[PDB]
Design an enzyme around this catalytic site. Sequence first.
Site, PDB file in Angstrom:
ATOM      1  N   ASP A  37       9.048  -5.644   0.935  1.00 58.42           N
ATOM      2  CA  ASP A  37       8.631  -4.834  -0.238  1.00 58.42           C
ATOM      3  C   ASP A  37       9.818  -4.477  -1.124  1.00 58.42           C
ATOM      4  OD1 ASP A  37       6.115  -5.003   0.863  1.00 58.42           O
ATOM      5  OD2 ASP A  37       5.649  -2.876   0.573  1.00 58.42           O
ATOM      6  N   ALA A  38      10.471  -5.457  -1.742  1.00 56.81           N
ATOM      7  CA  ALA A  38      11.524  -5.218  -2.747  1.00 56.81           C
ATOM      8  C   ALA A  38      11.050  -5.802  -4.070  1.00 56.81           C
ATOM      9  CB  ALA A  38      12.813  -5.832  -2.304  1.00 56.81           C
TER      10      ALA A  38
END
Lengths: 266, 52, 52, 77, 77, 76, 77, 77, 77, 77, 77, 77, 77, 67
Positions: free
Chosen positions: H59-60
């Site tokens: 989740d970047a």
Amino acid sequence: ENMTPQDYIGHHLNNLQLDLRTFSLVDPQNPPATFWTINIDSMFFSVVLGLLFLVLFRSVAKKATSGVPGKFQTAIELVIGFVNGSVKDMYHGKSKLIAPLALTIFVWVFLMNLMDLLPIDLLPYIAEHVLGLPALRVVPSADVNVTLSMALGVFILILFYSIKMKGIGGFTKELTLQPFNHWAFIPVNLILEGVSLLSKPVSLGLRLFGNMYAGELIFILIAGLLPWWSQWILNVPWAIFHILIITLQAFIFMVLTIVYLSMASE
Amino acid sequence: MNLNATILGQAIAFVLFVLFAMKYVWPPLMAAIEKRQKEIADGLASAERAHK
Amino acid sequence: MNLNATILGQAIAFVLFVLFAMKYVWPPLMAAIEKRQKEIADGLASAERAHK
Amino acid sequence: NLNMDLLYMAAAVMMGLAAIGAAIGIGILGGKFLEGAARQPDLIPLLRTQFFIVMGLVDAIPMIAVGLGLYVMFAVA
Amino acid sequence: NLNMDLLYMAAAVMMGLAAIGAAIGIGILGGKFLEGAARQPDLIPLLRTQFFIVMGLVDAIPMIAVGLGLYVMFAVA
Amino acid sequence: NLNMDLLYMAAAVMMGLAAIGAAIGIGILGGKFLEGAARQPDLIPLLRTQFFIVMGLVDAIPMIAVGLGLYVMFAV
Amino acid sequence: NLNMDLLYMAAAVMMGLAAIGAAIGIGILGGKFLEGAARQPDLIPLLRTQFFIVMGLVDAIPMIAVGLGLYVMFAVA
Amino acid sequence: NLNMDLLYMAAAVMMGLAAIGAAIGIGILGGKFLEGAARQPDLIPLLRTQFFIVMGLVDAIPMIAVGLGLYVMFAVA
Amino acid sequence: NLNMDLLYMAAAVMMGLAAIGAAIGIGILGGKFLEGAARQPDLIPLLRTQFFIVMGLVDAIPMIAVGLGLYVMFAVA
Amino acid sequence: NLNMDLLYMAAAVMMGLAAIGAAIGIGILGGKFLEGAARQPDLIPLLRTQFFIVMGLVDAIPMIAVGLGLYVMFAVA
Amino acid sequence: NLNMDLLYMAAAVMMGLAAIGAAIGIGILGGKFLEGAARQPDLIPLLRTQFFIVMGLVDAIPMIAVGLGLYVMFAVA
Amino acid sequence: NLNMDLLYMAAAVMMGLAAIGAAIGIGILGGKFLEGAARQPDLIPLLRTQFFIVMGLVDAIPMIAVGLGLYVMFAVA
Amino acid sequence: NLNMDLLYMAAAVMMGLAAIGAAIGIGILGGKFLEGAARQPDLIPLLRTQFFIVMGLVDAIPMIAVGLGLYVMFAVA
Amino acid sequence: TYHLDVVSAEQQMFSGLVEKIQVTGSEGELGIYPGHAPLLTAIKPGMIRIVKQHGHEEFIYLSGGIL
């Protein structure tokens, strides 16, 4: 002050530029065209944080006692051993430069990402009036030039090492006979390896940049859009979660740099 | 955003910071380590040769 | 909006942040510090036995 | 005018596709990393080293695309 | 004119698809590399050799794609 | 004219779908190659032979598609 | 002139989906071929026949869409 | 206003792709983490540690996505 | 004119989706067929028989669409 | 007219993508969870304890996009 | 009325999705069928029966889409 | 008028996306349940209990997406 | 012009996507069912009971969306 | 080559260096070349093929066991 949130969120994107052509400050409303306009606001925090790194390091390195290390010294040589272990794992050769480079990369970039953690209008609300500045964006890494500055500062080393440790010989070999291994396929091999090499550093720079640009971006939005009494119930998750982002994205910078260079030589 | 001469201004401070840490911090803080490892080895070589 | 209100709203978040960190992020890292301190002390004591 | 209508779609497509690719690839890799760790703890650190090797190749093209998305959304749009 | 807004989106689509394909096609390969490693670490160097040797092939078409994307988005604009 | 700039869209679609196909195909095939080599590390070269065979086969249609994409980009 | 470009777009849909389906379809099949080879190398020339024999069916429909794609590209101008 | 109507779709594509990616990646990763914990349930905390260490990388790009989506939908619009 | 042109796009879509469907289905089925072969080489003929008997189904609806592609390209043009 | 309807298209995409993501991710995690029970059934409560934490993390970014879809439908109308 | 050849597009889409869904679903089922057969090469009748039993349900819905596509093409357009 | 003939497209896309999400998600989940039953049929009813616990959670988003898809097709038009 | 062709296409989207969902979901579930059955030739009836139970929870959103596509066609179009 | 040992509970059936073997595993047929990565499996009753170094092939019959 008629600060509509659509425009407040806009101003924070501005930079304190210097129009070195006029040795002047580039105003936010009109941006002069030229390549000669230093972003002073981030650049200066660059040296500031490199100083807070080096002074606390030399102030033990030049003063190191091998007894029961002070509760302070403990953390510093802790990180030292962590770094050296990683480097020794992923690098095996003789070159002295690799390990200190990795240490600086790691801690310097960690701090540059860290400085996002303070409330983002704190220093921009102070510096406007205490100094008379139009803008100040605190996070050095949220501007591409510095991130690509470091990516190219390691590409410099990549070229240095790739020519040194295997001369023209193996360098040209891999640049001619890979991947397809046949001499008629050298035309195939050339361009592929060309932008393969050229992407590796750029992807490093952008991996560091975008994460932090869009880190700051989330803070600007929350700090501007929502009413005072609730910006915390979102800034809390986002900030404590971004703790992990800054840590990982600096550690990854170090790892990938070491891997690029060690792979080039050995 | 827009590329700027900052890309070159920062390459200076970077490359120089690397040297003013390498030449005067890194070998020192590894010396403080190795000079203790050399000592940690001696007690063990003692104990074993003394058993012998 | 009045910027005063946004600044106070930010300060609320920042105190709520720090007061969590000081009971979830500081203790573990100083515990790593303390573990390595103790584990140096033990390897000192070992040599002090060996010199018997 | 009409430019600003398109530019943000021309950005969002780039960035959404990069997100799909990055997240899916990193998860496919991280799953094989984790369940490998759970077999043999004290192989954890070596596997994590190699996982951080391999993750750096996954995030290359997605991050180029994110950089260009931010270029378009702010150098143009 | 409306040349440039569509040219922008064409590069964005080609390079987004490039990013998804490359990310996933490398993630799979790296996942198998890691699960091969965890069963016998002592083969890590050979299998990493094989990993790069192969992955340089997967990154053939996505590199072409990124090249053309940058060319269109800047050279042709 | 509208006649010129759409063709770049068509070429972009050809390039993107060919990239997806080639990347995923070679990824899967390489993954099974890697594990098969980890199984029999002394047969690496024979398996690499039989790997290159099907790697050639799998890039047939993607290389055709890239050919036509560069055609539309420069042959018109 | 107006008529021509839109049909070239239709060729991209034809051959883009044919590349995907053809590449990934065989890619799966190519995986099980190599995996079988690793468990029984002395059958590798036998199975090699069975790979092709089924591969002929794999690219059947992709081959149709290939033949038509160049027809709609070239012949129909 | 024309800008606002076109923008309120440009943001939708971005955040829909972000959601798909960030859900499927974490689903794969969590599934492997679960099988790991089940195999050796005395290890749950260490597994959670390495899990989070990988979840962040997943989740970047999806988080970068959400930010620009919201920026478009409420700063430009 | 356009009544002539767009039906070729509308055929191409069918042909591409039929390509993907048939290629993927036959690829997976052939993969399991090969995997059975490598593990039961003496039963190769029986599994070959069953593979045809079942493949006959997967290939039905795609070949509905495939012929309709030529229909709409030519039967109406 | 277009003003008022395009937001419904945007909401449709925005929430359909999120529904796909949430469904697939939660399904995969739950599948591995169930296979955890089937193997060590006395361990059900502990796996349940972990599942909900991980499952919420899967639904973290899927549900913000759904909320923004709701806002677009009912705030912007 | 320029709408005749647009219903053709709706039939094209509906029946391309029918092809995709049917091909992939029954391909997966046939794969598991062959994998069962390879273990119990005497029980091919029982499995080969159950395979039809469930395949009849797998493709139920796509068959309807094929029927409706033909309806649109011929009985309407 | 377009403003309300097109809504049926929005509702269509919204719940069409939700159709595959909810279906595939549970197909993924039921599978692990069935193979758990086949190994330890002693556990079945307790497995079936755990299955339901989340069986609804997979249908968290698809249902609300289904509703908001209907509301438009039946309350907006 | 913007009535009939614009309705059939929405019905096509709906029923095509429901086709994909039902096909792939029941494909996966039946694959696992055949696997279990080939493992446990004694549990065919218990397993098929469980299969039908869960399949009832796979199929009953496609039923919704397919019926709704028919309602679009036969109750609007 | 690698060293192969075929031993029962009672006596030693074969020994010495080999170039390859083909065994019928519980899961499926198998084949072991030198350096083959660690593996553990049951084997079904039936023959086993050995090639003694320098290609001298011979067949042994095994009632079952574990590889």
